[PDB]
Amino acid sequence: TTQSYTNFTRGVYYPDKVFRSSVLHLTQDLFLPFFSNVTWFPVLPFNDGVYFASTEKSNIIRGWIFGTTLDSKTQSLLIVNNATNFVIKVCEFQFCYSSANNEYVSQNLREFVFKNIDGYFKIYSKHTPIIQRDFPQGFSALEPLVDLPIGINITRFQTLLDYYVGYLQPRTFLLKYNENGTITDAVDCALDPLSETKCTLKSFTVEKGIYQTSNFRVQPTESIVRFPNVTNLCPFHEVFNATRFASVYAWNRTRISNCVADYSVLYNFASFSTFKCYGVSPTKLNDLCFTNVYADSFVIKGNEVSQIAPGQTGNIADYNYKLPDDFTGCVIAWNSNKLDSKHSGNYDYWYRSLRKSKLKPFERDISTEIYQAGNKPCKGKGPNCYFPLESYGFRPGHQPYRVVVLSFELPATVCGPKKSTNLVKNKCVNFNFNGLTGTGVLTKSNKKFLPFQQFGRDIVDTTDAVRDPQTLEILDITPCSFGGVSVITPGTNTSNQVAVLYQGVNCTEVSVAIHADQLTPTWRVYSTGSNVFQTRAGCLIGAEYVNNSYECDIPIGAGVCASYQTSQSIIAYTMS
Ligand SMILES: *[C@@H]1O[C@H](CO)[C@@H](O)[C@H](O)[C@H]1NC(C)=O
Ligand SMILES: *[C@@H]1O[C@H](CO)[C@@H](O)[C@H](O)[C@H]1NC(C)=O
Ligand SMILES: *[C@@H]1O[C@H](CO)[C@@H](O)[C@H](O)[C@H]1NC(C)=O
Ligand SMILES: *[C@@H]1O[C@H](CO)[C@@H](O)[C@H](O)[C@H]1NC(C)=O
Ligand SMILES: *[C@@H]1O[C@H](CO)[C@@H](O)[C@H](O)[C@H]1NC(C)=O
Ligand SMILES: *[C@@H]1O[C@H](CO)[C@@H](O)[C@H](O)[C@H]1NC(C)=O
Ligand SMILES: *[C@@H]1O[C@H](CO)[C@@H](O)[C@H](O)[C@H]1NC(C)=O
Numbered sequence: 001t002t003q004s005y006t007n008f009t010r011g012v013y014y015p016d017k018v019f020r021s022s023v024l025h026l027t028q029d030l031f032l033p034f035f036s037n038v039t040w041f042p043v044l045p046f047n048d049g050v051y052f053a054s055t056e057k058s059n060i061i062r063g064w065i066f067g068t069t070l071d072s073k074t075q076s077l078l079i080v081n082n083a084t085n086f087v088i089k090v091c092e093f094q095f096c097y098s099s100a101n102n103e104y105v106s107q108n109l110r111e112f113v114f115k116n117i118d119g120y121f122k123i124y125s126k127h128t129p130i131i132q133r134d135f136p137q138g139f140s141a142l143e144p145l146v147d148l149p150i151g152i153n154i155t156r157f158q159t160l161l162d163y164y165v166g167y168l169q170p171r172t173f174l175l176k177y178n179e180n181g182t183i184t185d186a187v188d189c190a191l192d193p194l195s196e197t198k199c200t201l202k203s204f205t206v207e208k209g210i211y212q213t214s215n216f217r218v219q220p221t222e223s224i225v226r227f228p229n230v231t232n233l234c235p236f237h238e239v240f241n242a243t244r245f246a247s248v249y250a251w252n253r254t255r256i257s258n259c260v261a262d263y264s265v266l267y268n269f270a271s272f273s274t275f276k277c278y279g280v281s282p283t284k285l286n287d288l289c290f291t292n293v294y295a296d297s298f299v300i301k302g303n304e305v306s307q308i309a310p311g312q313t314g315n316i317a318d319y320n321y322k323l324p325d326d327f328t329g330c331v332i333a334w335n336s337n338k339l340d341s342k343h344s345g346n347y348d349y350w351y352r353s354l355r356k357s358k359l360k361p362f363e364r365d366i367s368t369e370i371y372q373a374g375n376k377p378c379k380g381k382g383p384n385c386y387f388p389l390e391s392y393g394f395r396p397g398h399q400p401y402r403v404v405v406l407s408f409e410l411p412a413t414v415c416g417p418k419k420s421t422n423l424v425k426n427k428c429v430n431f432n433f434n435g436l437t438g439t440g441v442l443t444k445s446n447k448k449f450l451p452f453q454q455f456g457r458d459i460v461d462t463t464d465a466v467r468d469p470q471t472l473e474i475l476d477i478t479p480c481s482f483g484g485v486s487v488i489t490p491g492t493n494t495s496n497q498v499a500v501l502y503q504g505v506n507c508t509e510v511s512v513a514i515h516a517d518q519l520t521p522t523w524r525v526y527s528t529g530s531n532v533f534q535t536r537a538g539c540l541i542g543a544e545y546v547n548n549s550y551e552c553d554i555p556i557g558a559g560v561c562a563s564y565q566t567s568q569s570i571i572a573y574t575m576s
Helices: 194-200 508-515
Strands: 024-031 076-078 089-091 115-117 120-122 147-149 156-159 169-177 183-188 209-212 333-335 428-431 438-441 484-489 499-503 532-534 538-541 544-550 555-557 560-565 569-575
Touching: 169 194, 183 194, 194 484
Parallel strands: 544 569
Antiparallel strands: 024 169, 076 089, 115 120, 120 147, 169 183, 209 484, 428 438, 484 499, 499 538, 532 538, 555 560, 560 569
């Protein structure tokens, strides 16, 4: 009734329209992987596509049922088939139809490769008259039939009754095009060492020798996080809940340190209007640690809201407040008119707009001495001498607003909450120490760190050791294995047996990595007993050592060679 069947090598369709002839194309798409459990037939999940391939039944399978839940929900689709051919419809539908509510005809084996991507439905089909008992044997490419926009989300389907529903994954194929525009054969670039070299050479035949191929890398296992212990201070309420902040000329420089700052509380405090900033992207703030967080304050009239930014000098934002060009902070601001503005003016709401020269950024001057610019010693206003003063008068645009510019700098004190996970060590594991990211195998160090320096660098200027900021212990950041693999073949015309060579690894490390499934090359070679040899360039899998000494046929390295010799098997010997 339902058996796993893993003997299909079919389901190759035309990727596109453009004509080709007598070429070997290489393309990647969602193809059905060779030798995958399909079914041998309820509702089924629609991951990315299927390969409904029912054999002859004199048209009793009829159509299909699609949709997102198929039970009185978002619209569905039908693939009803009859003598007139397709009569497909798309609407909500209900229990069969009986209360359908809420399109054209297109004139043995019954293959389909239904695929729904980018709001388009694809019904590739091919009616192959295969009668011989060897049903799985043979090759037949599929031709597109109709593509129509459906727009609806599909994640399940039901047959409307020998079914062979399969599943689709993203893979890479090397297609063969005929002289008269057809496809004769194809090869999957994931199975065995053999059907990977034939993809890099872009040919269906290979000659004897070694062919360099892609790299191998040991994947990690889990992830850990380490943050400073706890403070629970987050004193952001003092700044943001003050009646009057300051003037533009005289402004606070509040310092914030030793707190577990939460940045999610600011979003509901007022009507923000300029919550944008540089250096660090917003909504990613609550994941990393800082060093010198500060906070300013202004009651700027509102015409210079765009003037508060790196640059944008406008003769008003150059004597009062100036930001550096490489300003790594945020310019959080909001709107306030109910309590700030008033029909009259304010004494301290002024700006010195008549100073001789602009300031270096991050500087403030309070001196109230009258400016002197006359030739003779001046006594008051009227000559070039004049004490700058404005005393701006608000009038309920022109409504004064509030600006709470921060200042970041990146020994860390201020950073957000994050769960802590106990150390594991001695495994290829991700890590997060305060603020950083990497991958390696942590272990107990043996260095002589002095009690003021945390990190540890190297000649190449790479991180080497980081102190744990909960136990005050030093560790190592050594990464784990990666390299390259080379495939040995004796020629397609002779045999189909290969060997592999993981370059430059003491491969007891990879032998255990096979069992726990950490390798990147998902394909595996038959690693039986008396079948692994440790060379000076790595280890050879699939060849057995021999005490004899012949002439070299395929040069390996370090003084050994591999040749195909007669039962027949690949052997590895020493040059002579
Ligand atoms: C293959 O699919 C069948 C479907 O019946 C399932 O039972 C079986 O466990 C699968 N085999 C795998 C995932 O190795
Ligand atoms: C796959 O298994 C089927 C089971 O019916 C068999 O007929 C077919 O020959 C097999 N194909 C192989 C082993 O390539
Ligand atoms: C498809 O779209 C509908 C309507 O917006 C939505 O409710 C549903 O979650 C989506 N389904 C899937 C499987 O993404
Ligand atoms: C189509 O291709 C086949 C296969 O090679 C060939 O025999 C046949 O002559 C071609 N038909 C043409 C060119 O009309
Ligand atoms: C600005 O100046 C002082 C300096 O200590 C600061 O503590 C205070 O919060 C600010 N004053 C007002 C009135 O906002
Ligand atoms: C961190 O806090 C825990 C809370 O139980 C405490 O036991 C531990 O000593 C603290 N560690 C340091 C280094 O202060
Ligand atoms: C490989 O590692 C094993 C186990 O630690 C060791 O006995 C052997 O000498 C190593 N081989 C080489 C070539 O370093």
